[PDB]
Enzyme design. Sequence first.
Site, PDB file in Angstrom:
ATOM      1  N   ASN A 180     -46.627 168.456 -56.719  1.00  0.00           N
ATOM      2  CA  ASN A 180     -46.313 169.673 -55.956  1.00  0.00           C
ATOM      3  C   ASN A 180     -47.008 170.911 -56.505  1.00  0.00           C
ATOM      4  O   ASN A 180     -47.424 170.940 -57.673  1.00  0.00           O
ATOM      5  CB  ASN A 180     -44.788 169.917 -55.901  1.00  0.00           C
ATOM      6  CG  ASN A 180     -44.346 170.621 -54.608  1.00  0.00           C
ATOM      7  OD1 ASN A 180     -45.057 171.489 -54.074  1.00  0.00           O
ATOM      8  ND2 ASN A 180     -43.192 170.221 -54.084  1.00  0.00           N
ATOM      9  N   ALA A 224     -47.658 174.065 -58.304  1.00  0.00           N
ATOM     10  CA  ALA A 224     -47.151 174.523 -59.599  1.00  0.00           C
ATOM     11  C   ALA A 224     -46.276 173.495 -60.328  1.00  0.00           C
ATOM     12  O   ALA A 224     -45.404 173.850 -61.113  1.00  0.00           O
ATOM     13  CB  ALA A 224     -46.459 175.875 -59.466  1.00  0.00           C
ATOM     14  N   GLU A 240     -59.216 171.805 -59.341  1.00  0.00           N
ATOM     15  CA  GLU A 240     -59.149 171.937 -57.900  1.00  0.00           C
ATOM     16  C   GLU A 240     -59.900 173.182 -57.460  1.00  0.00           C
ATOM     17  O   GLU A 240     -59.632 174.267 -57.944  1.00  0.00           O
ATOM     18  CB  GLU A 240     -57.707 172.025 -57.422  1.00  0.00           C
ATOM     19  CG  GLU A 240     -57.609 171.966 -55.931  1.00  0.00           C
ATOM     20  CD  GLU A 240     -56.184 172.085 -55.428  1.00  0.00           C
ATOM     21  OE1 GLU A 240     -55.597 171.038 -55.116  1.00  0.00           O
ATOM     22  OE2 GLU A 240     -55.659 173.218 -55.363  1.00  0.00           O
ATOM     23  N   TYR A 284     -52.785 181.733 -44.812  1.00  0.00           N
ATOM     24  CA  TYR A 284     -51.483 182.385 -45.065  1.00  0.00           C
ATOM     25  C   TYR A 284     -51.004 183.214 -43.862  1.00  0.00           C
ATOM     26  O   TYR A 284     -49.847 183.107 -43.450  1.00  0.00           O
ATOM     27  CB  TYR A 284     -51.545 183.243 -46.331  1.00  0.00           C
ATOM     28  CG  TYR A 284     -51.356 182.458 -47.619  1.00  0.00           C
ATOM     29  CD1 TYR A 284     -52.443 182.134 -48.418  1.00  0.00           C
ATOM     30  CD2 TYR A 284     -50.083 182.034 -48.031  1.00  0.00           C
ATOM     31  CE1 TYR A 284     -52.286 181.416 -49.604  1.00  0.00           C
ATOM     32  CE2 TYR A 284     -49.911 181.301 -49.224  1.00  0.00           C
ATOM     33  CZ  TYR A 284     -51.035 180.999 -49.997  1.00  0.00           C
ATOM     34  OH  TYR A 284     -50.931 180.290 -51.174  1.00  0.00           O
ATOM     35  N   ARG A 311     -55.863 166.744 -58.308  1.00  0.00           N
ATOM     36  CA  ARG A 311     -55.695 166.120 -56.997  1.00  0.00           C
ATOM     37  C   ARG A 311     -56.903 165.295 -56.538  1.00  0.00           C
ATOM     38  O   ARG A 311     -57.838 165.083 -57.289  1.00  0.00           O
ATOM     39  CB  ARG A 311     -55.210 167.096 -55.915  1.00  0.00           C
ATOM     40  CG  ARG A 311     -53.943 167.893 -56.288  1.00  0.00           C
ATOM     41  CD  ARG A 311     -53.316 168.556 -55.075  1.00  0.00           C
ATOM     42  NE  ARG A 311     -52.032 169.190 -55.399  1.00  0.00           N
ATOM     43  CZ  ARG A 311     -51.763 170.491 -55.295  1.00  0.00           C
ATOM     44  NH1 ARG A 311     -52.669 171.353 -54.826  1.00  0.00           N
ATOM     45  NH2 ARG A 311     -50.544 170.935 -55.618  1.00  0.00           N
ATOM     46  N   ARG A 316     -41.817 177.782 -61.158  1.00  0.00           N
ATOM     47  CA  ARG A 316     -43.139 177.881 -61.783  1.00  0.00           C
ATOM     48  C   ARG A 316     -44.136 178.703 -60.958  1.00  0.00           C
ATOM     49  O   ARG A 316     -45.104 179.239 -61.518  1.00  0.00           O
ATOM     50  CB  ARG A 316     -43.668 176.514 -62.205  1.00  0.00           C
ATOM     51  CG  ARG A 316     -42.723 175.787 -63.185  1.00  0.00           C
ATOM     52  CD  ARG A 316     -43.468 174.942 -64.179  1.00  0.00           C
ATOM     53  NE  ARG A 316     -42.561 174.346 -65.168  1.00  0.00           N
ATOM     54  CZ  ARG A 316     -42.379 173.037 -65.323  1.00  0.00           C
ATOM     55  NH1 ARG A 316     -43.057 172.187 -64.555  1.00  0.00           N
ATOM     56  NH2 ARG A 316     -41.514 172.575 -66.238  1.00  0.00           N
ATOM     57  N   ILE A 317     -43.881 178.823 -59.650  1.00  0.00           N
ATOM     58  CA  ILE A 317     -44.549 179.816 -58.791  1.00  0.00           C
ATOM     59  C   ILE A 317     -44.020 181.197 -59.169  1.00  0.00           C
ATOM     60  O   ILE A 317     -44.789 182.151 -59.299  1.00  0.00           O
ATOM     61  CB  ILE A 317     -44.292 179.579 -57.270  1.00  0.00           C
ATOM     62  CG1 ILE A 317     -44.937 178.272 -56.780  1.00  0.00           C
ATOM     63  CG2 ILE A 317     -44.808 180.762 -56.450  1.00  0.00           C
ATOM     64  CD1 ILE A 317     -44.489 177.832 -55.351  1.00  0.00           C
ATOM     65  N   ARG A 365     -45.640 181.850 -62.376  1.00  0.00           N
ATOM     66  CA  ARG A 365     -47.118 181.957 -62.314  1.00  0.00           C
ATOM     67  C   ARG A 365     -47.674 183.333 -61.937  1.00  0.00           C
ATOM     68  O   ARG A 365     -48.536 183.861 -62.638  1.00  0.00           O
ATOM     69  CB  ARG A 365     -47.758 180.853 -61.450  1.00  0.00           C
ATOM     70  CG  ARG A 365     -49.288 180.952 -61.348  1.00  0.00           C
ATOM     71  CD  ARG A 365     -49.809 180.261 -60.099  1.00  0.00           C
ATOM     72  NE  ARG A 365     -50.218 178.897 -60.371  1.00  0.00           N
ATOM     73  CZ  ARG A 365     -50.194 177.905 -59.492  1.00  0.00           C
ATOM     74  NH1 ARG A 365     -49.770 178.105 -58.248  1.00  0.00           N
ATOM     75  NH2 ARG A 365     -50.594 176.702 -59.863  1.00  0.00           N
ATOM     76  N   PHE A 420     -43.496 171.331 -71.013  1.00  0.00           N
ATOM     77  CA  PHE A 420     -44.276 170.456 -71.902  1.00  0.00           C
ATOM     78  C   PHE A 420     -45.403 171.129 -72.715  1.00  0.00           C
ATOM     79  O   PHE A 420     -46.178 170.440 -73.411  1.00  0.00           O
ATOM     80  CB  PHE A 420     -44.814 169.236 -71.131  1.00  0.00           C
ATOM     81  CG  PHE A 420     -45.742 169.586 -69.990  1.00  0.00           C
ATOM     82  CD1 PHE A 420     -47.079 169.935 -70.238  1.00  0.00           C
ATOM     83  CD2 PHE A 420     -45.290 169.551 -68.667  1.00  0.00           C
ATOM     84  CE1 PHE A 420     -47.944 170.262 -69.196  1.00  0.00           C
ATOM     85  CE2 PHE A 420     -46.148 169.881 -67.609  1.00  0.00           C
ATOM     86  CZ  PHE A 420     -47.478 170.241 -67.871  1.00  0.00           C
TER      87      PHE A 420
END
Lengths: 236, 234
Positions: free
Chosen positions: A11, A13, A35, A62, A104, A164-165, A168, A218
Amino acid sequence: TRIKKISIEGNIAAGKSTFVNILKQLSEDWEVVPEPVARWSNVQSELTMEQKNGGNVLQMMYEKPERWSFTFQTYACLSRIRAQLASLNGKLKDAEKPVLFFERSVYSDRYIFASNLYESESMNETEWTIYQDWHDWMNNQFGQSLELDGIIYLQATPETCLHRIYLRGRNEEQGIPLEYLEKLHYKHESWLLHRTLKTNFDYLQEVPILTLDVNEDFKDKYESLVEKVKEFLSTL
Amino acid sequence: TRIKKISIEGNIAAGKSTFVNILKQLSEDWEVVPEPVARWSNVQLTMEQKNGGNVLQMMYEKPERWSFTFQTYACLSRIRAQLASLNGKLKDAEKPVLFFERSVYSDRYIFASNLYESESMNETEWTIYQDWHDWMNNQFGQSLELDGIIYLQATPETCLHRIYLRGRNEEQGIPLEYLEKLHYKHESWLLHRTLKTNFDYLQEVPILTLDVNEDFKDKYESLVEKVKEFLSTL
Ligand SMILES: O=c1ccn([C@@H]2O[C@H](COP(=O)(O)OP(=O)(O)O)[C@@H](O)[C@H]2O)c(=O)[nH]1
Ligand SMILES: O=c1ccn([C@@H]2O[C@H](COP(=O)(O)OP(=O)(O)O)[C@@H](O)[C@H]2O)c(=O)[nH]1
Ligand SMILES: Nc1nc(=O)n([C@H]2C[C@H](O)[C@@H](CO)O2)cc1Br
Ligand SMILES: Nc1nc(=O)n([C@H]2C[C@H](O)[C@@H](CO)O2)cc1Br
């Protein structure tokens, strides 16, 4: 090619760029292809005709997805195929045990993002079936050097990703609701965990998958993740 | 590559398919690749056929929306038609020639360029389309590269009448003005040779111009004689 090819899937982030930035340094024999849509996002805090093009259509996606999904997906995949070839043809040459980790794959472009936009009606039948035809062809013509030796699935909960978004900092992305993160989550789970999903790519049926729980942070404690990557990688 | 590859170029209804079908009949060493989009017109379902018909109709109905999508599919469908011919046909021939009905240069430098200049593709679409086209024909364009070009020159008024003779519903609303834009790009690229292009070899590719303003379906021998003469120069 003596080079083994492993995609890092997960997924938005999940932590893929993080994980792959960790693996690159753990062996002169380990290499990475980031990516290309990862580089199209961040601000004018750099030149590039691909990036200006990518900058433009990303932002356009968007604002009006049902107008720009086909053009975006088309170009994102081109960009990925190009960049994957360049690393294959450029990197890892003097490596004894070369591992190329893809951020990816052509298959996430299709069976995650493109499939979702169609199901989300931002592509009609015509756009979707053209893309699928274009994708079969692009990948059976060039992408043959790119067939995956295995897949690492970084599994995090939709809610970790949201955070995490959160953590970020990309504006465009702050507006991704959980429900959209949830949709991609389900699709990763059916593709990778259950392996229900059929793909028009025969050998995929038989590619090894390694699933790693990445909910726990991690950054300072990745050694067991990499230990599982190292074991996975020996069976290959 | 011993198959000689020749493209036939010209405007809508100039006589390209007619002349191609004439050519094919004359020799055993001569084979044709008909242009995809031409087949997407008629009913008279293959996946390509289906997407193709749909996307041409959408294209007509709203070109500012559908032009990029149409142009990628057209060009993709054409590359695969030509690639299949080349690895299929003329295996035993002694002097093999494959005639293409149009090519990927007219896809980009007549049609896609015209749609750009019509404001039917915005700047990033044109830029992305050029990028994808450049990449592939520098990847694959290889064994498709041409040995020569044959340009069937008709006036826009001739094509207008021929469109009307051919009786495709769709095409009946094509205005002379659009035909006249397409005409200028052909004269430009193929006769005056002023157009600039990302494929350097095309600068030294030989061109045969044929005036097809006269009906030739029963009086084509002089057209064919020039083709043979051309073919010997290449
Ligand atoms: O175990 C982790 C994984 C990632 N992140 C952070 O989470 C965000 C998203 O990670 P990443 O850029 O790797 O996202 P992805 O490449 O999967 O889209 C970034 O700010 C990372 O620093 C983190 O703090 N701990
Ligand atoms: O010398 C000619 C060549 C063409 N045609 C007709 O004009 C129309 C347009 O021809 P064609 O479809 O071959 O043109 P293309 O679109 O392939 O360039 C068709 O109805 C042809 O039968 C004709 O009457 N006389
Ligand atoms: N093939 C793709 N399609 C997309 O829509 N995204 C989106 C999801 C997210 O908003 C951003 C990835 O940075 O672009 C990504 C890829 Br890769
Ligand atoms: N590459 C192309 N782009 C187009 O718009 N057409 C148009 C011309 C005509 O208006 C219709 C039928 O060929 O599609 C054709 C080709 Br080939």
